[PDB]
Amino acid sequence: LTEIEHLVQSVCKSYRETCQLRLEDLLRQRSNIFSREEVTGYQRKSMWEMWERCAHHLTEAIQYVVEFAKRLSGFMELCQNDQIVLLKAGAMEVVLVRMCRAYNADNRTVFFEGKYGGMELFRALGCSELISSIFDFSHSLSALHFSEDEIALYTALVLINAHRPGLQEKRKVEQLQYNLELAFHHHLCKTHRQSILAKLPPKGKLRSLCSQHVERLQIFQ
């Protein structure tokens, strides 16, 4: 009881403290859309330049997720090895989930460098299939109309995953995961939102999208 509802409020607080982007700013900026000439500007950048600027933005978003982990009940009590394994496996997946907040399903645009643009803005990356899959993924997640509280609890579980290969204190991650699931399940049951569980994307889907070009990021500043 009591303890579960306390865990729920602690995870929702850690999340709100560690957002890269205030929801109210993303929503207010939805009318601020890149011009054709601004899009053409992005489409003529070199593949290298466009990967450099996307790598920089991904790194910045990852730092806010590392701060989420630091503030998450139980995380900083796991062994250093397991903290590193969970972040390395989970941090980019949490960025991908956080990005459905910055996605406008009404015109299929995403917040990027101060305005909203469609997937054709990212043409110079030369990975149009991946961009289209990230847009498709965000479209599907946007459709759950997550509360900030639901996003907090869901992203806590994306991170605290006792099946990540290379964990050394597997039983201690399982104990923290189990408490987070009881927290998530209790919140959804109480709000009558338990139908969203069957709509959450498979873990293999988050993996493949978030890791398809990991080796490449190393060569960007």
Q: Which two tokens stand for residue 140?
A: 């599907």
Closest distance to ligand HBW from the beta carbon of 136 (Å): 11
Closest distance to ligand HBW from the beta carbon of 97 (Å): 9
Owner of token pair 């498979």: 202
Task: Write out the residues near ligand HBW by the rule CB under 6 A.
Answer: 21, 54, 57-58, 61, 92, 95-96, 99, 102, 110-112, 122, 125, 134, 209-214, 217
Q: Which is nearer to ligand HBW, 140 or 212 (CB)?
A: 212
Q: At what angle do helices 170-191 and 2-17 cross, to 10 degrees?
A: 100
Closest distance to ligand HBW from the beta carbon of 23 (Å): 11
Taking the C-alpha atoms of residue 10 and residue 198, their distance in angstroms, rounded to an integer, is: 25
Half-sphere exposure of 64 (CA within 13 A, CB side): 19
Q: Which is nearer to ligand HBW, 156 or 210 (CB)?
A: 210
Q: Which is nearer to ligand HBW, 35 or 128 (CB)?
A: 128
Owner of token pair 């290298």: 48
Integer CA distances (angstroms), 60 to 95, 125, 176, in order: 10, 19, 27
Q: Which is nearer to ligand HBW, 21 or 162 (CB)?
A: 21
H or E element: which one contains 100?
A: none
Closest distance to ligand HBW from the beta carbon of 96 (Å): 4
**Residue with the shortest CB distance to ligand HBW:** 57
Q: Which residues, other chains included, contact 158 with Cβ-Cβ below 8 Å and sequence gap of 6+?
A: 90, 93, 94, 97, 206
Closest distance to ligand HBW from the beta carbon of 191 (Å): 27
Q: Which is nearer to ligand HBW, 111 or 183 (CB)?
A: 111
H or E element: which one contains 81?
A: helix 80-98
Closest distance to ligand HBW from the beta carbon of 211 (Å): 6
Q: Which is nearer to ligand HBW, 65 or 176 (CB)?
A: 65
> Which amino acid makes up residue 21?
L
Taking the C-alpha atoms of residue 77 and residue 8, their distance in angstroms, rounded to an integer, is: 18
